[PDB]
Design a protein around this ligand. Structure first.
Ligand SMILES: OC[C@H]1O[C@H](O[C@H]2[C@@H](O)[C@H](O)[C@@H](CO)O[C@@H]2O)[C@@H](O)[C@@H](O)[C@@H]1O
Ligand SMILES: [Ca+2]
Ligand SMILES: [Ca+2]
Ligand SMILES: [Ca+2]
Ligand SMILES: [Ca+2]
Lengths: 226, 57
């Protein structure tokens, strides 16, 4: 299938922020710091919340996003993690990885912190929501987990990349794990079959920290119409 | 001319997209958007969201 770049739902360096400290077409918020080559969505500080969400909503049936980030801390343990969103409402502030709960769509959580004590972290995790669910934070949402995988994205030597395709009611998540700089050396993580989401709405990205804290930097967010 | 195709191909792909043009131009977002949308409408024949050198001339 053909792809079309959608600048209005994307960002990237080398000149990512405007003079006035704003990212074009995106609303950043809380403790998110945009900068010339990346947004530190949440810094390695206690109890951070930050999020960046598209201003305009977006109407495409099928799409893809490639998202490039680093998550970094001294410990082999870190927190809390990162979250890519497609959904209906801008969910800027809120308890779900910096962002709003009761969300209407999909959220792909890069859970650094093993919150249900299970040793199942760090892990990537897909979660549906129609406007009335409460994300089971303490249980990583292991119960609401449409699907998931166990890939380690912390402290890698190349920025990690996540291709997230929604093609014909099949969402799929590929992952370069920052071991190679081959920006198209994706490994299969997971996949959700037979899944609807709002016809329109925003893309966003968010993250957060608590007692433990990594830096959460996103370098780019490229979005495509299929 | 090619010198100018390249001034703002920062990612190096030999393709300009909306974000690379935004910077070319950098005023309000909507003002900006209108200009970028103009360029794509005007130049982006194959509608991939990029403009190659052919589309540029
Ligand atoms: O320690 C106080 C801390 O409580 C909560 O954070 C805890 C938990 O939610 C986090 O997942 C882990 C890792 O960061 O740390 C704590 O154990 C939060 O409510 C937080 O704001 C608070 O500082
Ligand atoms: Ca967790
Ligand atoms: Ca866990
Ligand atoms: Ca380019
Ligand atoms: Ca083109």
């Amino acid at each position: 299938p053909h792809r079309r770049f959608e600048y209005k739902y994307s960002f990237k360096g080398p000149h990512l922020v405007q003079s006035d400290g704003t990212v074009p077409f995106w609303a950043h918020a809380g403790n998110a710091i945009p900068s010339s080559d990346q947004i530190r969505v949440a810094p390695s500080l206690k109890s951070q919340r930050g999020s960046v969400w598209t201003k305009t909503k977006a109407a495409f049936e099928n799409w893809e996003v490639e998202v490039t980030f680093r998550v970094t801390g001294r410990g082999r343990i870190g927190a809390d993690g990162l979250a890519i969103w497609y959904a209906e409402n801008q969910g800027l502030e809120g308890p779900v990885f910096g962002s709003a709960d009761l969300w209407n769509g999909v959220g792909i959580f890069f859970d650094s912190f093993d919150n249900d004590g299970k040793k199942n972290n760090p892990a990537i995790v897909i979660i549906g929501n129609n406007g009335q669910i409460h994300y089971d934070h303490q249980n990583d949402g292991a119960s609401q987990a449409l699907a998931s995988c166990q890939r380690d994205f912390r402290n890698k030597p190349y920025p990690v990349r996540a291709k997230i395709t929604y093609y014909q009611n099949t969402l799929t998540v590929m992952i370069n794990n920052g071991f190679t700089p081959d920006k198209n050396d994706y490994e299969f993580c997971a996949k959700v079959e037979n899944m609807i989401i709002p016809a329109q709405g925003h893309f966003g990205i968010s993250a957060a920290t608590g007692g433990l804290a990594d830096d959460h930097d996103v370098l780019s967010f490229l979005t495509f119409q299929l | 001319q090619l010198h100018y195709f390249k001034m703002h191909d920062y990612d190096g792909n030999n393709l300009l997209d909306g974000l690379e043009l935004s910077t070319a131009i950098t005023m309000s977002e909507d003002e900006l958007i209108n200009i970028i949308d103009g360029v794509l409408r005007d130049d982006d024949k194959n509608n991939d969201g990029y403009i190659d050198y052919a589309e540029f001339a």
